[PDB]
Amino acid sequence: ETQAVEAGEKTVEQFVQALNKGDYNKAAEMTSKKAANKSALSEKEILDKYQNIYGAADVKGLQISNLKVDKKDDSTYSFSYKAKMNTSLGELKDLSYKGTLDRNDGQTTINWQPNLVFPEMEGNDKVSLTTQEAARGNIIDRNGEPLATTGKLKQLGVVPSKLGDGGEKTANIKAIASSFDLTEDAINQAISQSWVQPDYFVPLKIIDGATPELPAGATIQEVDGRYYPLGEAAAQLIGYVGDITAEDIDKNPELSSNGKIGRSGLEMAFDKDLRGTTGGKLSITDADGVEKKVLIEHEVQNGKDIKLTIDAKAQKTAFDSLGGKAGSTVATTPKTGDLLALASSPSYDPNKMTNGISQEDYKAYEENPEQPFISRFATGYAPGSTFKMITAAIGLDNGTIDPNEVLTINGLKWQKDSSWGSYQVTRVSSDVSQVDLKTALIYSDNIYAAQETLKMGEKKFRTGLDKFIFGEDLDLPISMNPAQISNEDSFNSDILLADTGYGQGELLINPIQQAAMYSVFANNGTLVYPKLIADKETKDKKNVIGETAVQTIVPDLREVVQDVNGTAHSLSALGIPLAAKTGTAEIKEKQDVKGKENSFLFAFNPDNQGYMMVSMLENKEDDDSATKRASELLQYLNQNYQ
Numbered sequence: 352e353t354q355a356v357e358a359g360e361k362t363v364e365q366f367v368q369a370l371n372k373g374d375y376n377k378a379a380e381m382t383s384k385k386a387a388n389k390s391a392l393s394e395k396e397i398l399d400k401y402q403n404i405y406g407a408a409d410v411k412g413l414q415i416s417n418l419k420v421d422k423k424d425d426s427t428y429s430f431s432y433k434a435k436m437n438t439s440l441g442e443l444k445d446l447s448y449k450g451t452l453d454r455n456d457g458q459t460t461i462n463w464q465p466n467l468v469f470p471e472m473e474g475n476d477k478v479s480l481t482t483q484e485a486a487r488g489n490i491i492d493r494n495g496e497p498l499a500t501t502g503k504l505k506q507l508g509v510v511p512s513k514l515g516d517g518g519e520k521t522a523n524i525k526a527i528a529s530s531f532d533l534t535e536d537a538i539n540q541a542i543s544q545s546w547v548q549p550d551y552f553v554p555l556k557i558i559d560g561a562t563p564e565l566p567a568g569a570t571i572q573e574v575d576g577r578y579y580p581l582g583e584a585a586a587q588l589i590g591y592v593g594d595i596t597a598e599d600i601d602k603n604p605e606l607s608s609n610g611k612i613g614r615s616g617l618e619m620a621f622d623k624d625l626r627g628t629t630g631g632k633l634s635i636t637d638a639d640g641v642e643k644k645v646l647i648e649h650e651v652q653n654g655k656d657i658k659l660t661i662d663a664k665a666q667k668t669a670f671d672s673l674g675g676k677a678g679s680t681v682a683t684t685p686k687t688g689d690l691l692a693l694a695s696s697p698s699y700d701p702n703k704m705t706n707g708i709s710q711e712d713y714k715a716y717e718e719n720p721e722q723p724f725i726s727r728f729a730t731g732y733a734p735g736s737t738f739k740m741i742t743a744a745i746g747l748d749n750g751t752i753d754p755n756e757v758l759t760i761n762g763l764k765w766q767k768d769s770s771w772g773s774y775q776v777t778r779v780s781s782d783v784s785q786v787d788l789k790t791a792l793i794y795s796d797n798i799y800a801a802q803e804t805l806k807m808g809e810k811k812f813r814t815g816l817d818k819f820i821f822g823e824d825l826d827l828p829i830s831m832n833p834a835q836i837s838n839e840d841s842f843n844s845d846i847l848l849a850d851t852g853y854g855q856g857e858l859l860i861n862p863i864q865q866a867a868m869y870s871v872f873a874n875n876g877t878l879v880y881p882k883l884i885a886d887k888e889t890k891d892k893k894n895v896i897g898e899t900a901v902q903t904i905v906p907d908l909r910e911v912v913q914d915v916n917g918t919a920h921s922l923s924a925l926g927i928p929l930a931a932k933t934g935t936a937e938i939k940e941k942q943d944v945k946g947k948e949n950s951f952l953f954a955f956n957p958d959n960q961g962y963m964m965v966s967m968l969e970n971k972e973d974d975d976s977a978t979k980r981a982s983e984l985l986q987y988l989n990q991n992y993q
Contacts, residue, residue: 352422358459359420359428359452366461367434371413375401382463383453390463391474397463404468404478408633409439409604420452428452428459439482439604440633440647446470469635471644477636484607485627487577488654490589490617493689493885496663499589499618502578504706505562505571507531508554511542514568526566531556557706577611577705581663583698584670587726588661588829590616591701605629611705616726617657620828627654658885660689668987669694669966672980677969679727681862682984684992685873685955685963687889688882690863691992692984693829695727721970729831731859732967735951737934738854739800740904741868742807743788744876745815747900751807754903757785758802765798767805767845774846776801776853780916792907793917795933797853804852809842812852818895819868819878826890827863827883834860834868855936866965869953871896872905872930873960905930905957919952919978927989930957933978938970952977954985962988 362381369378379397382390392400404410418432429451435444447470451462465472472478490499509527514520528535533555542553552570562571577592579585592611600608607629613619630651635644662682669680673696682692699716700708716723746752761784764775776798783790791799804812813836822833837857842848850856860868863881870879878892908930911917919931934951947970955963964984966977 482631488625590618735934735936800853801849962992
C-alpha cells in the first residue's frame with residue numbers, strides 16, 4: 352500500500368504546486384473523470400473555476416503542511432492537509448482541506464470537488480469579494496507642514512462636442528491654449544486620442560492657482576490626488592507615486608489595484624506604512640448572494656503619517672539657492688543629527704510625474720546631462736579639499752602635526768620626487784612661503800595637507816580614518832552605499848595617499864555621510880549620526896577625534912571667514928558667528944579633455960552648535976562656488992537653530 356500512498360502524496364503535492372504557480376490547466380489535468388464520487392466538473396470547467404475565484408481574490412502562494420494520505424477502498428485514497436494562502440485581504444491561514452484520490456490503470460488522480468477551491472464550498476456555491484481602499488498617509492515637516500499629502504486638485508479638460516465645428520473650434524482651442532498655458536498641438540493631440548468619444552471629458556492639466564476664465568468647451572472638475580507642496584525643491588527626497596499595475600498586484604496582492612504606489616524616494620521607502628491596509632470581506636455564498644461563510648473580513652485601516660526632521664523652509668531655501676545648477680545641500684542640527692534639509696539640484700516636478708506626464712517631458716528629464724533624477728545627497732563624491740580638517744585632526748591626534756610649526760612651501764606646485772611625473776599638488780597662492788596649520792586652513796593649502804599626510808604615513812592616516820564611519824550602513828530610509836577610503840585596503844601609492852590627504856583620490860563620501868563626519872567639530876570630537884525620522888533616538892560615536900584637535904581647528908575655521916584672505920571671507924558680511932571650510936575637487940570625465948571642478952562649503956555655528964551645513968556645486972561653471980550661494984540658508988539656520 353505504501354507505494355500508492357506515496358503516489359498519492361506526490362499527486363497532491365504536484366496539484367498544490369500547480370495551483371501555487373497559477374497554472375490552473377496543469378492542476379485540472381490531474382483530476383479524475385467527471386462523475387458522481389469522482390470529479391464534480393470537467394478539466395476546462397475546473398480551470399475556469401480557479402481562474403475566476405483565485406483571480407478575483409488575487410490568490411498568491413498556496414503553501415500546505417501536515418499532509419496525510421490513507422487508503423479507503425481498493426482504488427480510493429483519502430487525503431487531508433492544512434493550507435494557507437495570500438489574498439488581496441491578507442493571509443488566509445489554518446485552512447483544512449480534504450478529499451479523495453482515484454487509482455485506475457497505473458496512475459493516481461484527484462477526485463476534484465469544489466471544496467478544493469475553498470474548504471467549505473459545495474455544489475454551485477459562489478465567492479464574493481468586497482473591498483474598500485485605504486487612504487494614503489501624509490509625510491510632514493518637523494513642525495507638521497505637509498511634504499506629501501492628499502488634496503483636492505482642479506483638473507482642466509475639454510469636451511470635444513462643446514468646442515465647435517470648424518472656425519469656432521479652432522478659436523476655442525486657441526483660447527484654451529493661451530488662457531491655460533498649453534500648446535495648440537497638445538490640445539489637438541489630446542482630443543484626438545483613440546479612446547476619446549465626442550461627449551467625453553478629455554483631461555488636459557492640473558490647474559494650480561486660481562482658475563481663469565473658461566472658454567467654450569473648457570471645464571474644471573475636482574479630483575483627489577497626491578500633492579507635493581514643495582514641488583521640485585524636495586522631489587528627490589520625497590519621491591512620487593504612480594498608478595498601480597497588474598504586475599505590482601502579482602508581486603503584492605495586499606496592494607489596491609485602484610490605488611497609488613511609491614515609485615521613488617520616501618514615498619517608496621515608506622510605501623507599506625503610508626498605503627494602509629485594504630478593508631473588505633471575502634465570503635462564500637449560496638446558489639446566489641446568500642452568505643454562508645465569511646473567509647476574511649476586516650475594516651479599512653488608513654495609512655500612518657511619517658514625520659521628518661526636515662524643515663520645509665530650510666528645504667526650500669537650500670534648493671532655491673542652487674539656482675538650478677548641479678549640486679546638493681545638507682543641513683543638520685549637529686548635536687542631535689536632525690536632517691533639516693536634503694536638497695538636490697537640478698530637479699523634476701513630482702506633481703507632474705504623479706498627475707500624468709508627457710513622454711517628451713519625461714525624456715527631457717532623462718536626457719538632461721545634469722540628470723535631475725539623481726539624489727545627490729545620497730551619491731558618493733570625493734569630499735574635496737574641505738577634507739583637510741579631518742587630515743589635520745588626525746595629525747594633531749597622533750602628534751604628527753605641530754600647529755605652530757611651519758613648512759616651507761614655494762610656488763604653486765609641489766611633487767615629492769620625479770617618480771610622480773606629471774602629477775603635482777597645486778595651491779592657489781604663492782604669497783605665503785612659511786605655512787603652518789592655521790595658514791593652510793585659511794588659504795586652503797593642499798600642498799601643506801599633502802606633505803603632512805605623507806609625513807604621517809598610511810598606517811597612522813588610516814588609523815585615524817577608521818575611527819570614522821567608512822564602511823558603515825547608516826540607519827536611514829534613503830538608499831545609499833557606505834563611504835569608502837579607497838578601492839582597496841592599501842593605497843599602494845604615495846600619490847594616492849597624498850591625494851587622499853586633501854579629499855581627493857578614491858574617497859567616496861555622500862553629502863549626508865560628510866555631515867556625519869564633520870559633526871565632530873560641533874561635539875568635541877564625538878561623531879553624531881544623522882537622523883531623518885523625528886521620533887528616532889540620537890545615536891553617536893565617542894572619541895572619533897580628540898577634544899584638543901577640535902579646540903585647535905575650530906578657531907582656525909573661524910579665521911577662514913574673518914581673515915581678509917580667508918577663502919570664505921565673503922560670509923563675514925553676514926555678521927554672525929561662523930566657522931567654515933571651503934574646498935574643491937578636480938575630476939577628469941571622459942567626454943571632456945579639460946577637467947571639471949566640484950566646489951564645496953562646510954559651515955556651522957561655533958558658538959552654539961545649533962546648525963551645520965555641507966553644500967556642493969558639481970561641475971561648476973566659471974566664477975561659481977558653494978560659498979557664493981550660502982548666505983541665505985546660513986541667515987535662516989542661524990536665526991532658528993541655536
